[PDB]
Design a protein around this ligand. Structure first.
Ligand code: HEM
Length: 291
């Protein structure tokens, strides 16, 4: 498969800036969701999950085709709870009917990070909605109960190296796990709708204890009321991962620069951009525009 980016016909920077302003104004407005966390966290989880299906070997999956709109991918167990991010974005898609799904799903992830005071993420337009038979089979997204060897190996399919995996996992500063969606329960930290290097500081500074939760799964619980998944705790058990965790715990700017590069790489995998395509867009936040 080749997937060539095609700009939505006749649209420029300013049209996409309005779709960004619309997602961001609705983030401000529906601030009550999930006990006042807001929709920001489930929108960057949605952007990672439609992108994390990519397979570098046959170029199938990933964000291009917008295939989460189809029932098979939508009812994948691994995607339980994402229906809330989809429901949020659907009024915005009725308002801007010209934007493709893959561009809407991935721009939601970019708007959420920058409006939660994260770094600027360069974004590119150009995904095209492809048919229901290009929709990937379930089982391409990662298990929760595993170790650092599984983590390295899984991310090799999307060809992320060690630094990119650790920068990307820092998004777990946001949101929380929910027992009814995944079988795990609890937040990774305290400021869970602000984007900081907190996930790394907690992994290193808390006194984690292994215990079973009410679903019968294991997780690392700390005295402060925080949790860590087996896959998150893996990052201080592996000597290569642990040096990068420490680097981000000591330097938030270095984490912001690396997360920014790795998150755009995640959202662009499997997509060929023609040299005539526009440069990546840097959107202004509500606040920078005075809105
Ligand atoms: C080995 C990799 C990963 C595993 C096993 C994993 C697993 C999970 C699980 C089990 C949840 C909670 C689901 C629920 O109960 O609602 C979750 C939530 C979340 N994940 Fe990860 N994750 C991984 C990677 C990532 C990456 C790379 C990103 C983003 C760049 C990400 C972003 C999020 C966010 C923001 C949430 C919070 C969602 C909410 O509050 O509803 N995850 N993840």
């Amino acid at each position: 498969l080749v997937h060539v980016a095609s700009v939505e016909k006749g649209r420029s920077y300013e049209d996409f800036q309005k779709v960004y302003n619309a997602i961001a104004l609705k983030l401000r407005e529906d601030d009550e969701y999930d006990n006042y966390i807001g929709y920001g966290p489930v929108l960057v989880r949605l952007a990672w999950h439609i992108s994390g299906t990519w397979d570098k070997h046959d170029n199938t999956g990933g964000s291009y085709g917008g295939t989460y709109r189809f029932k098979k991918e939508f009812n994948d167990p691994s995607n339980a709870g994402l229906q809330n991010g989809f429901k949020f974005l659907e009024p915005i898609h009725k308002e801007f009917p010209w934007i493709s799904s893959g561009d809407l799903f991935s721009l939601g992830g970019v708007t959420a990070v920058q409006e939660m005071q994260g770094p600027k993420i360069p974004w590119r337009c150009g995904r095209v909605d492809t048919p229901e038979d290009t929709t990937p089979d379930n089982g391409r997204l990662p298990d929760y109960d595993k170790d650092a060897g599984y983590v390295r190996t899984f991310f090799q399919r999307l060809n992320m190296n060690d630094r990119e995996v650790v920068a990307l996992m820092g998004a777990h500063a946001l949101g929380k796990t929910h027992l009814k969606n995944s079988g795990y329960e609890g937040p990774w930290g305290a400021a869970n709708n602000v984007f900081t290097n907190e996930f790394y500081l907690n992994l290193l500074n808390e006194d984690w204890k292994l215990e079973k939760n009410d679903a019968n799964n294991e997780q690392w619980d700390s005295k402060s009321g925080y949790m860590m998944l087996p896959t998150d705790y893996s990052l201080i058990q592996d000597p290569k991962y642990l040096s990068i965790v420490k680097e981000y715990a000591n330097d938030q700017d270095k984490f912001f620069k690396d997360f920014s590069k790795a998150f755009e790489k995640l959202l662009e995998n499997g997509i060929t951009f023609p040299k005539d395509a526009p440069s990546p867009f840097i959107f202004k936040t509500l606040e920078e525009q005075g809105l």
